[PDB]
Design an enzyme around this catalytic site. Structure first.
Site, PDB file in Angstrom:
ATOM      1  N   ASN A 183       0.806  -1.226   0.000  1.00 59.63           N
ATOM      2  CA  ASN A 183       0.000   0.000   0.000  1.00 59.63           C
ATOM      3  C   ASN A 183       0.843   1.283   0.000  1.00 59.63           C
ATOM      4  OD1 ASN A 183      -1.997  -1.971   2.192  1.00 59.63           O
ATOM      5  ND2 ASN A 183      -2.512  -1.560   0.047  1.00 59.63           N
ATOM      6  N   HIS A 185       3.122   2.345   2.133  1.00 61.97           N
ATOM      7  CA  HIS A 185       3.399   2.886   3.459  1.00 61.97           C
ATOM      8  C   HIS A 185       4.677   2.237   3.983  1.00 61.97           C
ATOM      9  CE1 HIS A 185      -0.499   4.742   3.638  1.00 61.97           C
ATOM     10  NE2 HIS A 185      -1.047   3.602   3.223  1.00 61.97           N
ATOM     11  N   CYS A 220       6.122   7.645   8.996  1.00 64.07           N
ATOM     12  CA  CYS A 220       7.229   8.264   8.258  1.00 64.07           C
ATOM     13  C   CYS A 220       6.772   8.131   6.807  1.00 64.07           C
ATOM     14  CB  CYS A 220       8.559   7.534   8.480  1.00 64.07           C
ATOM     15  SG  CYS A 220       9.901   8.016   7.339  1.00 64.07           S
TER      16      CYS A 220
END
Ligand SMILES: NS(=O)(=O)c1ccccc1F
Ligand SMILES: NS(=O)(=O)c1ccccc1F
Ligand SMILES: NS(=O)(=O)c1ccccc1F
Ligand SMILES: NS(=O)(=O)c1ccccc1F
Lengths: 261, 265
Positions: A183, A185, A220
């Site tokens: 995804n 991330h 992050c």
């Protein structure tokens, strides 16, 4: 892997890979963390979940991860991992794990994680609704089943914020494409690796990591740069802080416990 | 995994993991590269190797990768089973070669293939040498006698000369550093990290609209644990081709060069 007889937990066996071990010829804590995430994802798939609430743009996000390892498995060894989830009312949910040596049947490690409900857009947290809690409970044990049962245990301790100056630091850490999930991330395990980057190599060479507790405050992004800070609090114990390289915004804090080899 | 009936090759099946796939829900080229290295290490163990023979060990001699060439037709999806067959062959005094064939375990079709060139080097002085006759003898018994090539073709991409990228590069990714997870059990940077670093200077738009089909990477010098690397890329070309260069961030010492071929999704 497969769900257990009662359908309330999930087990899976893994053979340790050559690139998964460190200098001691045993799996790193990041290999362990990746295996825990993998058996968790496989348990989700077995009971029909995606890695009803999709329409509301609601997702589960990790707030805390706690791992305790007694023995790290060696290259070529088989590790068996059992995992299960439990609801904690309106606070959120919890996923627990037990790691065993497949040959001896002994417990070689255990882990627990706390998850909170948030909107994917806006990133706003929420209390769990009864409608969600209803369809979640059917895939969990009804009576409490804790990987860390002990009253006043390490997994539930409050973590303080590291004060400047840090004793040790590793600055300018950036995720590469391999650090991202499907995804896009940053994978939660990368944060563990970044925390450990500020531990001196001498501690790594003379000690084995026994316990790690990590709080996840903020994600992050792909284009962010992180600083990893560590101060000795003590067996050797450390206090950790990951913050953005520029403005100093906190992304994580944690503690590690190391035992002399 | 296990050695085949003749004992001259090795096969192993792998189920693709959730953290091993990219945005397309299929294994990344680094997951593929890691699986190739793993089946290689398992083949070495199956026939009694560390890759050092008993004669190499006393002389502090090791096999080191000089080139890696990978061609993927289909990347396996999360939860799919991939079967990989690997084997080695001697190339006289130049060195050795390890080849691989990747197949979909369900259909039996070839989904990819790879070849790697290895040279003999002294572990301490880093000095290359030609393969001695004594080393070639105990090596040959674990390899096919007749040539068995993953890339048989007369004008195959695996043997093409790679040129050095000229400044200025079109694209760049600067200040890349290995972390502990990028190291192997012997504390050396894992060869797969170099592939990831090469690909870091490809723009995200090419990644999002293209699938990587071929990658050829030359290994000139090792990146130490405390080194910092710069990744440089320039377009050389419905198909997109790039020229790549990895060099130390300071003095500009070359560590790798390579080429990639990408096709529109
Ligand atoms: N709880 S989790 O997302 O499965 C997870 C697994 C391993 C490391 C960190 C994590 F957050
Ligand atoms: N939410 S989850 O991780 O997909 C899940 C998987 C299995 C059982 C209960 C659960 F809640
Ligand atoms: N030939 S090798 O060392 O198995 C290797 C495997 C994967 C990537 C790069 C490599 F060099
Ligand atoms: N050198 S090696 O990678 O250990 C090897 C393993 C198996 C067969 C032949 C070989 F040469």
């Amino acid at each position: 892997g497969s769900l257990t007889e009662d359908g309330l937990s999930y087990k899976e066996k893994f053979v340790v890979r050559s690139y998964e071990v460190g200098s001691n010829k045993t799996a790193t804590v990041e290999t362990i963390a990746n295996l825990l995430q993998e058996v968790g994802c496989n348990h989700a798939q077995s009971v029909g979940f995606s890695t009803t609430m999709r329409k509301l743009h609601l997702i589960w996000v990790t707030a805390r991860m706690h791992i305790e390892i007694y023995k790290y498995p060696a290259w070529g060894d088989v590790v068996e991992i059992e995992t299960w989830c439990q609801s904690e009312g309106r606070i959120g949910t919890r996923r627990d794990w037990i790691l065993k040596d497949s040959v001896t049947g002994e417990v070689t490690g255990r882990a627990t994680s706390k998850w909170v409900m948030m909107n994917q857009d806006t990133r706003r947290l929420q209390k769990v609704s009864d409608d969600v809690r209803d369809e979640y409970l059917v895939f969990c044990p009804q009576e409490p089943r804790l990987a860390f049962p002990e009253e006043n245990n390490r997994s539930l301790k409050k973590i303080p914020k590291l004060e400047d100056p840090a004793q040790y630091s590793m600055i300018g850490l950036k995720p590469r494409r391999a650090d991202l999930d499907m995804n896009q991330h940053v994978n939660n395990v990368t944060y563990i690796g970044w925390v450990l980057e500020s531990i001196p190599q001498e501690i790594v060479d003379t000690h084995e990591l026994q316990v790690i507790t990590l709080d996840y405050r903020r994600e992050c992004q792909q284009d962010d740069v992180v600083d990893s800070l560590t101060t000795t609090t003590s067996d050797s114990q450390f206090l950790h802080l990951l913050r953005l390289s520029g403005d100093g915004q906190e992304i994580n804090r944690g503690t590690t416990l190391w035992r002399k080899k």
